Structure formats: C-alpha cells, structure tokens
Design a protein around this ligand. Structure first.
Ligand SMILES: NCCc1ccc(S(=O)(=O)F)cc1
Ligand SMILES: [Cl-]
Ligand SMILES: [Cl-]
Ligand SMILES: [Cl-]
Lengths: 427, 436
C-alpha cells in the first residue's frame, strides 16, 4: 500500500506504529511504520513519534568517496562533513526545471553516441539479461563519460545494489586505479547489508546527484545497477502492487535543473532474470519512456563486446544532443544510414539462409558484408577504448564506403560531397 | 552447408543421410538430413554439386481463405484437402515476391494504443512484446478479427498462425474465427504443443508462404499474426543439429544464428505494389534463459514494438499496452491527411508527452503528497489516469475506427489547460479541440 518514506531512527518504533514525518518546509505527513533497520525506519505514508527524514550529508567532498547504501564510509575515510543535510526522499528541494533534456553526453561507446545518443537530463536504461556484460558496460561509461565543450563541470554517481564482496572490491579497484573515482560518488550496497539499505541506495545516489547538479552547477550522470535487484528487495520486504508507483519516485528524479547550468542523467540497468521460478520477471517499463540501450545475446555469443544491438535500441531525445556545435553536422545522416544499412544487411543474412550466399545479388552482397563490418569495426571496441564522437562518425564513414555511393539514400548529397572519404578534401 | 529446406517424407531416413531433392522450381538439390517427423524431413542443402524426395509444398489457392489447417497445411476443420492453384516451396525461395519499397499506409487494428500512438503500416514487422501470464493471445486474436485497410483498393486478408498451443486454446481459436465471421478473410494454421516439433518449425513458413502468395499473386494486403515466436524457438533449439549443443560454443550449428532472420526477412511491400505482407509476431519473454537458451529474439525488433505491461494488467486494464516504451518506427508513413487524419501526429505526440509527464508526477505525488502538487501538475496527474482509463482501456470486442480513437484522444486532452498543449499546432486546436 502507500508510498515509502525513509526516516532517521531517533527513537524506538514498532511495526504499524502511526508516526508523523517532518518535511523540509516544516509541514508533516502521517504514515505507518512498515519495517526498519537499526538506523533507518521505513514508513508507508497515508503524543505520537514525529520523525526526521533520513538525510544525505552533502558536500562537494562526496566526490572521490566510496560509501555504503546508507552514505557511511566504505573506503576507510572519515564520515562526510556536510555543507547540508538533504532529505533523500526527494521532497526537501525540487531542483528540476520544466525544460526538455538536451545537449550531448559522450559515453565513448559508438553504439550509444553514434546511433542512440545520450543527452543531458535523459533517463536511458540499459536493457539486459543474465549472463550478459551490462556491468562492464556500466563501468566503461562511468570511466569514459564526458560533456564535450560544456561550461559546466561533470560528475558521476555510481550506485550498485545487492552486490557480492567480490564485485564490490572489483568496482572499488576499477574506480581507484583509473582515476574515475576522483569525479564520482560511489554507493555500494552489498547483498548481505540490511535490505532496507538496498532500497535507500538509489535515493542516496539521486540526492547526491541533485545536490551536485543544482547547488554546484554540474552535469551529473547517475548509473544504477540494477533495478531488478532493487525490485527483489521490495519483494523480500510476484512483486508488491505499490512497486510501480515506488519506481516512479526513482524515474521522476532526472532532468535539467533550475538555472539550466546543471542536470541529472540516469542510466539504470534493467536486467531480465535468467530463471523466473526463483526470480519472477518484474515490469520495469515505467523506467522506459525515453528509449533504451539493448544488450543482445546474439552479439555476445559471437564474441563481440560491447554486445549492443542498435536496431532495437533507441534514444528518443537524440536529436536534441547532436549536430553542429554539439557533435558534428553529419551525425544524424550517418546514424540514419548506418542504421538502415545494418538492418538491410541483417535481413539479407536471412535471405542467404533461404536461397544460399551465391544467389544474392552483388548489391545485396555489399549490404550483407556491411552488416559484418558494422559489428566487427563499429559495435566491437575495447573495454578501455574511449572513442570521441568524431572517431565514431569516421568509423561510420569508413564502413559506409563499402556500400555503393548511390545506395546512401539517408545522406544528403551535401554531406556525401563534404565527408564521404571518396570526395572529402584534405585540409 | 547452406539453407534448410523442408521435404515430403516417403521413407525413414537417418541423421546426416545424403539425399537428392526435387525443388518446387524443378531443379534438384543434394543435401543432408537433420531431423524428421512422420511426414516431413528437414534437410540442409549443399551449394551446386540414394533417397530422392520432393519438397514439402503449400497448396496455394485463394480457397485457403476460410480454412483452419494444421502446421503442415492439413485440414483441421473437417473439410477436404486444399485444391491447389500452385504448389509452392515454403522456405521463402518461392515467388521472390518483395519489392525494394518502404512500408507505408495505414492498417487499422481497431486498438487505440496501436493505431493512435504506434501506428501499424503495410509491409512493417511490429512485434508484440509480452510475458507469461499476460493477455498477448487475446490481443493477437482481437487484431485478427478487427484489422482492415481503410480506403484501400486492394482486398485484405489475415493469416493467423499459432504455435505450441493446447487443445483448449485450439478449440477457442476455431470457435472465435467461426463465430465472428473473421474466418472468411483468414487462413488459420494451428500447431499443438504435442504435434511434432518439426511441424512447429514448418508452421510459420506455411503461413508466410500463404501470405506471400495472396499478397503477390492476388494483390492483397495480408496481415500475418504469429503466436508465439518463443514457442517456435523452444522447438528449434531441440531440433536436428542443435540438440544438446550450446549457443556460442563449438558444436552449435551455424544455421541457428540465422534461422530467425529467415522469418523476419519475409515482410514488406510486394512487387507491383498492389499488396503487402505485414507481420505481428508475438515475442513472449521466456523466463528460462538459464535452462533453455534460445536464439536471440532481438533480431526481430527493427521497426518498433508494442509492449504489454503487467502494471496495467494488474490495474484491471485491457489491453494492457504501455505506449511509452512502445514504438512504431514507420508510423509517419501510415498517418495524416488521406491516410488517417491531418491532426493524427499532433494528437499522438501530445497524448504521449502528457501521459509520460503524468506518470512521472505519480512519483512526485508519492515524494511530496497530493496536497503539495501544483494545480497544473495535478491536471497532468489526472490526465494519465484518463489516458489509462478511457484511451488504453477498450473492450475485447470493441473495434475503434481511427476517428473514434482520435476523438477519445481529444476528449481526454480537454482535461489539460489549452495553453499547456505545446505539441499541437494552433491550426489543429482551432479546427479539432472540442472547445473550438
Ligand atoms: N474504472 C472502471 C471501469 C472499468 C471498465 C472495464 C473493466 S473490465 O472489467 O473490462 F476490465 C473494469 C473497469
Ligand atoms: Cl552501511
Ligand atoms: Cl511486476
Ligand atoms: Cl543468437
């Protein structure tokens, strides 16, 4: 029933106790205690205890720290000294502007920047499944993401839920050794930590991102891995009917912030369970309103990292993040043409398995070969290969040369003459 | 080793047996047997350069319409075997029917969350993405009974192919097609769970060959509904050379990586441009990836998808389609003046944006409480309820024309302040808004 609000444990409470919760403006909401850890009370909202909301200790000094799901140090450092104590439920400060997401976030991964571009303020889930490398892709984006040319500084907030010890040490090591830590706040919730902390983890993370974005004028990228495990924690506390509204209190929290010098961008990982007997398939579609990045078993089976299939992927806001002054003027054309040539080449793989390879026409054979060049040169890149959008677009142009120039129906002749390697002038 | 073909069994055969096959075009192929049922052999052919067989054929005639057949094209309806005009091979090699033209123009399914916001166009492949326990079967059957091509000079037909189904489901589909009269414009292929696996593998090939024959030889727009590609894949991963082999590992046969493309290649406008083959495949998320790895179904998703949402199912709403993750990539080629109506794109864009905003505000309401939400936000919050209750919700038997759909859209859009309709041109507000 009713939505979840998190409260600091200041006095003992009982199950089903009726309580008041003090909101950031001095008003109070009433609810009932649902559960609690030793330090955090979970309240369902509709003489008596009046509770304070659970707070994040907020400071620019959160950057470079690795913390638990409850905000406590996990890196052997001192507790955070706060500038502000901010309600993590999201209710003390409305940082979001009524503005659409826009302008480019360069992940350095061609199958996102090139064909499915992430924009500032967007929520763009990675949609994956058991046994696929969504975790490596999330960490690669956390190492590589930037906002080319932005006057606002950039930060990452990386929140991992229900993870093993082994995973935790791997994530800490990767952030530390690459320097990615120095612009990040990292929240790690272990599988064995109290379960209440698992559901507080993304609220801590989004609070930190809102504080950096709005009070320090930053574009902040929040990567949340992964929401299925968060759904699991609600279930443990089919999925509960209130889960769909609860998820909305996570996916409402994204966008450009007031003043438009900062933004909160989310990339949640939505992984489908590999055995629905023990882990039922949750409906996480509420999070998918601005497109998705699809991690595909076919590509992984073929030994290609990252195994992202651009055809089912989409970024509904891409056009607000690309072109002259953002990426390059020819970006939309090249994206459209690669998409169309790869879709045609893939259908032609079907055709070769109907009529045989030697029956395909010479033109069809160019498109068949293009689908292989696309997967081998454009989709495939190294774990630590950080490609600028220029790099991405020039790979695109090189593999597009395999097609007959007269078959480039998605590219304006003005871009063919300016950028196609057969016509472009050396400057 | 190349393509898989399907052959009339006339004697027992062994695995990997070399066979000569007379093809539908009169030429001969040599190939190796992979598997068989009582009456069908699956053969992988060799390029160019013992048992001699003929290919399994569809008995193609316009008199397939009105008939209920098995996966192999045998009658299920107590009628006589089809009398063929032509006997066509079924693997996709027959006819060479497809044009190099883009899909376009409207198919009216009568369901608003398809036509209104994610429009199906002639020649498109638009999958329904769903999961166990959701009503994807009912949606597939509703579109089969309701679909048409408004204003087209070409005749319309449905090919409905159901794979791996129970006897009770088969009984229900027969009754439904018969009782509503949808049968007279349909060919129905029913494959049962306990029919041979190889018959399940042939089932979508029979169906697509019938659709290509009616589209290309008879100038029809044909809508092929395939339910469920997941159950097709669960048969495929146990057939022939795939048995107990693991995707991505040595021993897994190359043809497994291209089989589903032999189904999804088979759609489009046909030569002559008087007809077309449109597919609505059902892709149910299987739930058992660990124990039954199948070919990746994502290859089927290139022109959008219709997403069936358990949230909406649990709220009591049918059809429980969530338009926000749903997409039709070819929608703009099927809408607007002379296809649907000139305000269609604007109304869809505005519904989509208000619904997405309202759904975000269900999160903000939970964060701050209803009493704290602004008057403007409350109107959008309410709009997402009106969208779900009035536009998404429609009856199983309710066939809305596109005009019925746009009119419901306008009505619910009057709940928003007119100055908040930023995706609708003023020309359209004055012409079509209920207050003007
Ligand atoms: N808001 C209630 C209106 C309504 C309308 C139809 C149904 S149903 O039984 O067909 F699912 C349920 C509720
Ligand atoms: Cl902790
Ligand atoms: Cl669910
Ligand atoms: Cl695969």
């Amino acid at each position: 029933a009713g939505p979840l609000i998190f409260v600091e444990k200041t006095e003992p409470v009982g199950y089903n106790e009726i309580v008041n919760i003090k909101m950031g403006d001095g008003t109070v909401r009433r609810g009932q205690v649902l559960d609690s850890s030793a330090d955090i009370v979970v309240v369902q909202v509709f003489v008596i205890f009046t509770g304070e909301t659970l707070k994040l200790p907020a400071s620019v000094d959160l950057l470079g720290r690795i913390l638990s799901g409850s905000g406590e140090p996990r890196d052997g450092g001192p507790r955070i000294v706060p500038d502000q104590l901010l309600d993590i439920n999201g209710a003390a400060m409305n940082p979001y502007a009524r503005l659409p997401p826009k302008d480019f976030i360069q992940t350095g991964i061609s199958t996102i920047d090139g064909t499915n571009t992430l924009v500032r303020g967007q929520k763009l889930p990675i949609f994956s499944a058991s046994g696929l490398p969504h975790t490596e892709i999330a960490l690669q984006i956390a190492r590589q993401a930037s906002v080319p040319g932005s006057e606002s500084a950039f930060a990452v907030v990386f929140a991992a839920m229900g993870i093993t010890n082994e995973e935790a040490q791997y994530f800490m090591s990767d952030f530390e050794k690459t320097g990615a830590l120095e612009r990040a706040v990292v929240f790690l919730n272990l599988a064995d930590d109290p379960a209440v902390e698992r559901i507080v983890t993304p609220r801590m993370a989004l609070t930190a991102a809102e504080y950096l974005a709005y009070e320090h004028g930053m574009h902040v990228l929040v990567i949340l891995t992964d929401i299925t495990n968060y759904a699991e924690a609600l279930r443990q506390m089919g999925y509960p009917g209130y889960m769909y509204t609860d998820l909305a209190t996570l996916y409402e929290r994204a966008g450009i912030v007031k003043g438009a010098k900062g933004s909160v961008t989310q990339i949640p990982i939505l992984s489908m369970p590999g055995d629905d007997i023990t882990h039922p398939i949750p409906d996480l579609s509420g999070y998918i309103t601005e497109g998705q990045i699809v991690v595909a078993r076919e590509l992984h089976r073929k030994g290609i990292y990252p195994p992202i299939n651009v055809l089912p992927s989409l970024s509904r806001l891409m056009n607000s993040g690309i072109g002259a002054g953002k990426t390059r003027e020819d970006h939309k054309a090249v994206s459209d043409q690669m998409y169309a040539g790869y879709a045609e080449g893939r259908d032609l793989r079907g055709l070769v398995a109907i009529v045989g390879k030697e029956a395909l026409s010479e033109r069809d054979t160019k498109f068949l070969e293009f689908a292989d060049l696309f997967e081998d040169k454009f989709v495939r890149q190294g774990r630590n290969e950080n490609r600028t959008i220029e790099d991405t677009l020039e790979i695109g142009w090189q593999i597009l040369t395999h097609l007959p120039e007269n078959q480039l129906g998605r590219i304006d002749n003005k871009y063919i003459q300016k950028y196609h390697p057969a016509h472009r002038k050396a400057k």
